[PDB]
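User: Modeling request: complex.
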Amino acid sequence: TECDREPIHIPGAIQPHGYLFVVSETDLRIASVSANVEDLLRQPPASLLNVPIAHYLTAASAARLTHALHGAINPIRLDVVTPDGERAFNGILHRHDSIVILELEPRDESRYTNEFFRSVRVAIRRLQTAADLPTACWIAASEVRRITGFDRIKVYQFAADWSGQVIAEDRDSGIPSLLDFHFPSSDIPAQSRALYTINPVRIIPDIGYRPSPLVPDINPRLGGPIDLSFSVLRSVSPTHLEYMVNMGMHAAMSISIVRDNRLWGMISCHNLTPRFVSYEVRQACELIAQVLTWQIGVLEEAEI
Amino acid sequence: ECDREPIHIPGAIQPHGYLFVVSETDLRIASVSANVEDLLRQPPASLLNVPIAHYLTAASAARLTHALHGAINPIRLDVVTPDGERAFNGILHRHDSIVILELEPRDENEFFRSVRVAIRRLQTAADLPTACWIAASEVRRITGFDRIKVYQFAADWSGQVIAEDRDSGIPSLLDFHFPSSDIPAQSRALYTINPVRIIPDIGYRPSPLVPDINPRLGGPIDLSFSVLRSVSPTHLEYMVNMGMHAAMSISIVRDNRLWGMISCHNLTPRFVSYEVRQACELIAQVLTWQIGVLEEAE
Ligand SMILES: *C/C=C1/C(=C/c2[nH]c(/C=C3[NH+]=C(/C=C4\NC(=O)C(C=C)=C4C)C(C)=C\3CCC(=O)O)c(CCC(=O)O)c2C)NC(=O)[C@@H]1C
Ligand SMILES: *C/C=C1/C(=C/c2[nH]c(/C=C3[NH+]=C(/C=C4\NC(=O)C(C=C)=C4C)C(C)=C\3CCC(=O)O)c(CCC(=O)O)c2C)NC(=O)[C@H]1C
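Assistant: Request completed. Predicted assembly structure:
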């Protein structure tokens, strides 16, 4: 059990469905980039170092980024000017270790946002009058399946020894069930659980991805590798990826359930084939999770 | 008496929309609002017993029909009139062995973003009064009503304005107490199971229901769940004296009890679409949850 020792927070690489920049808070000069940016901008990664990021954004997007930093914000629409035309992205901004990390994801694509809001609203209301826990958990899982389209959503609860059990499940036809199944504690080891307590949402749209390294993997203010703890594109442990290969599910997304600053459980979402869920859909899942979290407590207290 | 007026059976609607009562079976018209004569250019009596599909486009009729199969509202409906098609938001309710169908004007992206951020600001509300202000201001940003108020009831069913957000030179009602007779018992009860209401123009002339009869069970048509229900003259009177010509309120229900109301007032007449009202209700619903989270900061 070297399981718990792998330093998952500093992998020096990202999942390539998105792009990452470290930029300075002053004039927003680039201090590191993911190597896959070469395909975006058609230039060697090294050559972007210390270049103002605004050179590759539209004026409106430059303005919008600058306002976001120097003054609720995520995601921010950013348009990148590339040699092969202007490309539109969801910009995901954060500050950690004296630096600013910008990540560029694909945008939200729904033709059905009003329906989306309605479903989230009726789910929150239902969750709030759930009379027992498996009912509350199942309302959560089924709404999450509604808005993600993933094949199988599970609510996984931790025992005192950090093993866990699937206590609720909603899945599409054909898909095998893991309901009531028990899993060993080493499947979600100690450093992962610590990270998931402070960073409650993660997605792996394609478990077969080729990691794209950071160039360079150095924090410009503090030295050392770039801490990707709070980054949405952080490359994930190869050992977990291999676990998922054996599971037969090639997209994964999970949301933490956190009670008393402690991991109570996870909403785990699997898909057979690779699949992306937009930032805004992930924020909706997190909302659902947070209401579920409150109701877990209401139910626990009602017994005692 | 305030609490004795049967506000749920006025036998008339607000004329910014149209009401049809139809049968559960083959959707033949059992009653219409009198103003449907302006839409279809026939009298109500000529409409009675005609399948409502007769006045809908083929696709509109197909959607209406599947809605009554089995999360449905609003249904887009295009109606066939002498003067061409008109598109509508169809709001369908099913009760008392009849179907009520109401047509409203349809909607109209910055919009979708602004609901998302409102909710994200509520998710990180520091305290209960701040959460209420946020809901007030975000409701005001998306509705465009001149003044929004979070109004909380007391033990004795009287209440006060605990939060507010308003435009330049609209009067403030912050911290003002009002008596329980202002929202009387039969109202509070309705508003506990029917959470949103809008009056786009205080001074509307009601359009009567023709005929005002439930065809399966007898009696006045129960409009409890109707979005176009005509409201109490006594309340209209009061809004006229307040000097405000549009209102819209959303209920806050905690523990199967009315906890409070979000009240939105405009100086002039002002409709907003089913979709924005639904957005505001989402906001009310997130605020509701948060009231419990922030209250338990104790
Ligand atoms: C003897 C009876 C009445 C009386 C009756 C009455 N009121 C209402 C509906 C009300 N009243 C409301 C009151 C307020 N709006 C505010 O902004 C504030 C305070 C800041 C108050 C106290 C509200 C919000 C409603 C709901 C509709 C809306 O949002 O405007 C009704 C029922 C109307 C209906 O048909 O549903 C009735 C019968 N009002 C009196 O003043 C008098 C004592
Ligand atoms: C010796 C190390 C091992 C190991 C490490 C490992 N696992 C994770 C992350 C996750 N593991 C999860 C397990 C489950 N998913 C399920 O659906 C179920 C049961 C139904 C289980 C038990 C989950 C959910 C995660 C979170 C990611 C996701 O949602 O898929 C990590 C951390 C990965 C990272 O963030 O970098 C690590 C290091 N897993 C093992 O099985 C042993 C070999």
